Amino acid sequence: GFDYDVVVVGGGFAGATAARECGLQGYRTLLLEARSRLGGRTFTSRFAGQEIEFGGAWVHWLQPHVWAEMQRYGLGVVEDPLTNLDKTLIMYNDGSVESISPDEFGKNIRIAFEKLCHDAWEVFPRPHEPMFTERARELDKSSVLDRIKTLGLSRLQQAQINSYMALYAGETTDKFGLPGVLKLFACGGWNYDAFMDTETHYRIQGGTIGLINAMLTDSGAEVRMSVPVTAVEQVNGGVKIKTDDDEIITAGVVVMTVPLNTYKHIGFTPALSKGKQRFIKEGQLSKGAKLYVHVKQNLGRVFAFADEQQPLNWVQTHDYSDELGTILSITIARKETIDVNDRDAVTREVQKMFPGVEVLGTAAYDWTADPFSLGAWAAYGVGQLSRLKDLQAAEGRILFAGAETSNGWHANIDGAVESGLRAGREVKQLLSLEHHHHHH
Amino acid sequence: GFDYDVVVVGGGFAGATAARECGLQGYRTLLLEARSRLGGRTFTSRFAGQEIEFGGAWVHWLQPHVWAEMQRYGLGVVEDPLTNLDKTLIMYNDGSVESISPDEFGKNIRIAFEKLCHDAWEVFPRPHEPMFTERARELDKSSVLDRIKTLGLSRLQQAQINSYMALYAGETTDKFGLPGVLKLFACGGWNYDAFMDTETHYRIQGGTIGLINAMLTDSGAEVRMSVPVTAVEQVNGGVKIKTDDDEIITAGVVVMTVPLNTYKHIGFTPALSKGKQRFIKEGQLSKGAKLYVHVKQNLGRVFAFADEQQPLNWVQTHDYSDELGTILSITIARKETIDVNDRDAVTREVQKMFPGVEVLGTAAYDWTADPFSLGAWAAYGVGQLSRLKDLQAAEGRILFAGAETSNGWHANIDGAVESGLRAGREVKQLLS
Ligand SMILES: Cc1cc2nc3c(=O)[nH]c(=O)nc-3n(C[C@H](O)[C@H](O)[C@H](O)COP(=O)(O)OP(=O)(O)OC[C@H]3O[C@@H](n4cnc5c(N)ncnc54)[C@H](O)[C@@H]3O)c2cc1C
Ligand SMILES: Cc1cc2nc3c(=O)[nH]c(=O)nc-3n(C[C@H](O)[C@H](O)[C@H](O)COP(=O)(O)OP(=O)(O)OC[C@H]3O[C@@H](n4cnc5c(N)ncnc54)[C@H](O)[C@@H]3O)c2cc1C
Ligand SMILES: CN1CCC[C@H]1c1cccnc1
Ligand SMILES: CN1CCC[C@H]1c1cccnc1
Numbered sequence A: 001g002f003d004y005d006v007v008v009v010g011g012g013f014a015g016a017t018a019a020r021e022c023g024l025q026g027y028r029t030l031l032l033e034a035r036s037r038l039g040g041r042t043f044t045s046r047f048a049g050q051e052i053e054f055g056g057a058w059v060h061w062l063q064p065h066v067w068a069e070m071q072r073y074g075l076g077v078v079e080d081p082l083t084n085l086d087k088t089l090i091m092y093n094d095g096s097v098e099s100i101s102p103d104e105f106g107k108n109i110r111i112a113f114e115k116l117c118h119d120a121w122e123v124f125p126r127p128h129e130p131m132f133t134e135r136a137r138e139l140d141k142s143s144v145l146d147r148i149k150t151l152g153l154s155r156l157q158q159a160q161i162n163s164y165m166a167l168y169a170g171e172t173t174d175k176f177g178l179p180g181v182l183k184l185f186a187c188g189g190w191n192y193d194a195f196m197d198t199e200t201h202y203r204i205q206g207g208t209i210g211l212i213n214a215m216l217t218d219s220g221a222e223v224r225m226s227v228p229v230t231a232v233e234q235v236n237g238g239v240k241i242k243t244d245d246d247e248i249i250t251a252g253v254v255v256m257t258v259p260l261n262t263y264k265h266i267g268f269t270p271a272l273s274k275g276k277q278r279f280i281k282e283g284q285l286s287k288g289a290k291l292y293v294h295v296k297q298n299l300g301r302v303f304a305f306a307d308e309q310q311p312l313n314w315v316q317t318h319d320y321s322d323e324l325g326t327i328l329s330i331t332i333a334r335k336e337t338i339d340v341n342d343r344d345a346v347t348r349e350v351q352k353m354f355p356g357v358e359v360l361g362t363a364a365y366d367w368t369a370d371p372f373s374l375g376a377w378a379a380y381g382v383g384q385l386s387r388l389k390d391l392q393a394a395e396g397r398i399l400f401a402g403a404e405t406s407n408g409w410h411a412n413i414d415g416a417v418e419s420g421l422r423a424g425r426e427v428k429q430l431l432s433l434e435h436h437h438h439h440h
Numbered sequence B: 001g002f003d004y005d006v007v008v009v010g011g012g013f014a015g016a017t018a019a020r021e022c023g024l025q026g027y028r029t030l031l032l033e034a035r036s037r038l039g040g041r042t043f044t045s046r047f048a049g050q051e052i053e054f055g056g057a058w059v060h061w062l063q064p065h066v067w068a069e070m071q072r073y074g075l076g077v078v079e080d081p082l083t084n085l086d087k088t089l090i091m092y093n094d095g096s097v098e099s100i101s102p103d104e105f106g107k108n109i110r111i112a113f114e115k116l117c118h119d120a121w122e123v124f125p126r127p128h129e130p131m132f133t134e135r136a137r138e139l140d141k142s143s144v145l146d147r148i149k150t151l152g153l154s155r156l157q158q159a160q161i162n163s164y165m166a167l168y169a170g171e172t173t174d175k176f177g178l179p180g181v182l183k184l185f186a187c188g189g190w191n192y193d194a195f196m197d198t199e200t201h202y203r204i205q206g207g208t209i210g211l212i213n214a215m216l217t218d219s220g221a222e223v224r225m226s227v228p229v230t231a232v233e234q235v236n237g238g239v240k241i242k243t244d245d246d247e248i249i250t251a252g253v254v255v256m257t258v259p260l261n262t263y264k265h266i267g268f269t270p271a272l273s274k275g276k277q278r279f280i281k282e283g284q285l286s287k288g289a290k291l292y293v294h295v296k297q298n299l300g301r302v303f304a305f306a307d308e309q310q311p312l313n314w315v316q317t318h319d320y321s322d323e324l325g326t327i328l329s330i331t332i333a334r335k336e337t338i339d340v341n342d343r344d345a346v347t348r349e350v351q352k353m354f355p356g357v358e359v360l361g362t363a364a365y366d367w368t369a370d371p372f373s374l375g376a377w378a379a380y381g382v383g384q385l386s387r388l389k390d391l392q393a394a395e396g397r398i399l400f401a402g403a404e405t406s407n408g409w410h411a412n413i414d415g416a417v418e419s420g421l422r423a424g425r426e427v428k429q430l431l432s
Helices: A013-024 A064-072 A102-116 A134-141 A144-151 A155-169 A178-187 A192-200 A208-219 A260-265 A274-282 A343-353 A385-392 A413-430 B013-024 B064-073 B102-116 B134-138 B144-151 B155-169 B178-187 B192-200 B208-219 B260-265 B274-282 B343-353 B385-392 B413-430
Strands: A004-009 A029-033 A044-047 A050-053 A077-079 A087-091 A097-100 A202-204 A222-225 A229-235 A238-243 A248-256 A267-269 A289-295 A302-306 A314-321 A325-332 A359-366 A398-400 B004-009 B029-032 B044-047 B050-053 B077-079 B087-091 B097-100 B202-204 B222-224 B229-235 B238-243 B248-256 B267-269 B289-295 B302-306 B314-321 B325-332 B359-366 B398-400
Touching: A004 A013, A004 A238, A013 A029, A013 A064, A013 A208, A013 A248, A013 A413, A029 A248, A044 A208, A044 A359, A050 A314, A050 A325, A064 A208, A064 A413, A064 B064, A064 B413, A087 A102, A087 A155, A087 A343, A097 A102, A102 A144, A102 A155, A102 A192, A102 A302, A134 A178, A134 A385, A144 A155, A144 A178, A155 A178, A155 A302, A178 A192, A178 A385, A202 A208, A229 A248, A248 A413, A260 A274, A274 A385, A289 A343, A343 A359, A398 A413, A413 B064, B004 B013, B004 B238, B013 B029, B013 B064, B013 B208, B013 B248, B013 B413, B029 B248, B044 B208, B044 B359, B050 B314, B050 B325, B064 B208, B064 B413, B087 B102, B087 B155, B087 B343, B097 B102, B102 B144, B102 B155, B102 B192, B102 B302, B134 B178, B144 B155, B144 B178, B155 B178, B155 B302, B178 B192, B178 B385, B202 B208, B229 B248, B248 B413, B260 B274, B274 B385, B289 B343, B343 B359, B398 B413
Parallel strands: A004 A029, A004 A248, A029 A222, A087 A302, A229 A267, A248 A398, B004 B029, B004 B248, B029 B222, B087 B302, B229 B267, B248 B398
Antiparallel strands: A044 A050, A077 A202, A087 A097, A229 A238, A238 A248, A289 A325, A289 A359, A302 A314, A314 A325, B044 B050, B077 B202, B087 B097, B229 B238, B238 B248, B289 B325, B289 B359, B302 B314, B314 B325
């Protein structure tokens, strides 16, 4: 006799996917979102008269779950200008910037990446079962920097691969766990060209908020925003959910999809398992932020890397024309490295990378400052991947989802969608009337 | 008003996927299956005390739709012994058999395959929009053999790649359209290692019938077996479907998922578009069949190619042990080349590739003989891919699905599932 059959906490892709599965099963589904908006770590906004993505933006057909969703809801891709580049730059730790011909830039980053993932085939023959091989659990004691040191690359190759890996870490490469990178590379077909195509090339048509809205509208679930959940208590046959205004909402099952780094805001009765509590105390590495810069000059199609001691770690063209100028999509590995609020400062840094450009605008999202992300994409530290199931395991009638809890594209939208599907399966298992299956 | 909201004709992966989408949308969904079994061109059966797949068998995580379904319904994979091979054989057109070192076999087939798809990246940057580039459009005037001739391969490499392409054609390579092959290679990440990993390595746990049963059970739809559909007639706001016992079932919308080569068995009133009728009259190339052989000796992990003029085109180990022996999974490009019901004849052909094998058993499925498949996997002839839209286009309140109508893995289960998702979306558009 609970208020709802299932309550999904979080309006991200994991929460929307879970709510859609549960909703189309006929359950009474309620979704609670702490922010006043949906999308979670994806954020569709506006800047310089265009639609932009402050968070997750790019998907690919080699990512199975999100692509299946796009086929279901009839969404294709929108291509960003990543081919036929006009300029390619590398900024080293000292701040010097070197312009390289795009062809040799691509060949060097290809060589560096493929040498860093030389054993991806043998370590991860099944990327969606990450602990399948004993050499993978055994390589969870090493960082990305540890391998980079043994690669023996050129100065430019090491700078590029360290910029890539620092960006994916949201931190310096000494803290970044190696198996997660090997596993993501394996997810993209064990081939650098395809994997690179998966990461920053194609956006969702109508925006990520379009797919979120498609799933939640299809679900028929009730969606409540500006309702943060502060505590969850398991009772017999159900759960009691308490919000920051102390209401009580009772449910048969609750699916937790909040980011790992935010679990400290919610109290659980009884306390979670020691493994899950340890994961909550370590959290996840990324400290990233996203910045868009509108410049009056037309720079064409530009791509740039910047090493971990510089702020503009990933630079890419969003749109360009004589009329417009250029809109730059920039991803920052660590928010500490730049005051994205001091716009002389970001202008100085931009002009440090592109000399003499007049800046017309920027807009930036600091995912570290947001109390409901407290970090950016999922980035596993050393030794964390091996304990991943400790995060996935259900605790009573509390299910756990989110990109951090996925087996495949854990740093991506696809991982969130996957965890949402798994959450829907487990919800069906708990609310199942005749045939009850809960293996592992 | 009508008997049902939606009627899905066909109990394959496309039909089961469509029935699942429509069923969980709340429509009253009825699915009609001509055979007494489900699965369509996949068939989970038994042989030599083991589970076997007479049709579609192998899936991969680089195939998005079927992998998403496996994630939803909690199905893992079963690995077949395809790595660390013990023997690799090539049988040329003359019937001579040559044993190659597995490493040299692997990079010879790698070289041939990657030279065959050297432009796959340019031509298909978006494999799920096959006509995105204009060079795909006019590489649709070429056969796969046309390119193989320009590759200038070795004897061995040409034998291997022509055996591969002949099996994927279900026909000789001179009739096989090139862009479909380039597009499938593009779907697997433009890389031969990944693409080969997608095709014959991993089966579904619990079998393909397990996934079909998961989808249809989830759907809540009504399923009728041994009910072939003979005619479809459009009235306003609905469709009239007539079975082979002359009952009439009225529906708001009908989803056709039957194989292309069987469309001659169904009359449409009004008649379909001239493009669709053209596709129905050309059909699709494949003439393949599948054969399992039980031998007393343990050959270990074996893989073998046979060129288009020999019958045992694709050979690989299904299971092996000293007590068991060996169970061989063999795919035959053209059923004409071997009489799979004469156990003695196929014993001779098996013994031609592995000399001195005592054969303990056989089991075979002839997909050409089945009136409800009349062919095997989807295989596009020259120029057919360019008209793919003609097959996909809806005609009134009749929607069309099936692996032949998919944009991606058209020769696979994943293509059928994709077409089922699109069919569900179009049903949602019509009934809202
Ligand atoms: C800048 C950036 C770039 C990235 N780029 C890409 C990319 O290009 N492609 C890609 O695939 N992925 C990308 N990622 C990763 C990605 O977008 C995430 O993996 C994905 O959005 C995770 O979704 P989620 O549902 O698992 O979690 P979230 O999206 O964070 O959802 C959790 C939800 O829970 C809410 N919440 C938190 N606490 C509470 C509480 N106490 N009560 C109620 N609600 C609460 C939050 O508001 C949020 O809505 C990027 C992420 C960022 C931030
Ligand atoms: C030997 C073989 C090997 C292959 N191997 C693989 C593989 O390893 N991996 C892979 O992914 N794919 C493989 N394929 C291809 C594959 O299995 C098909 O792509 C897929 O099953 C297509 O499904 P479908 O729903 O589109 O059509 P079908 O599976 O053929 O379903 C159509 C249904 O319609 C029914 N039907 C026909 N006419 C009528 C009528 N008039 N009235 C009512 N019903 C009718 C049929 O009985 C059938 O059940 C293989 C196929 C075969 C045969
Ligand atoms: C998609 N990627 C996965 C994690 C980070 C994210 C990314 C990569 C490059 C630039 N910005 C964001
Ligand atoms: C799955 N493949 C796709 C089309 C044919 C089919 C196949 C390939 C190799 C051996 N048997 C069947």
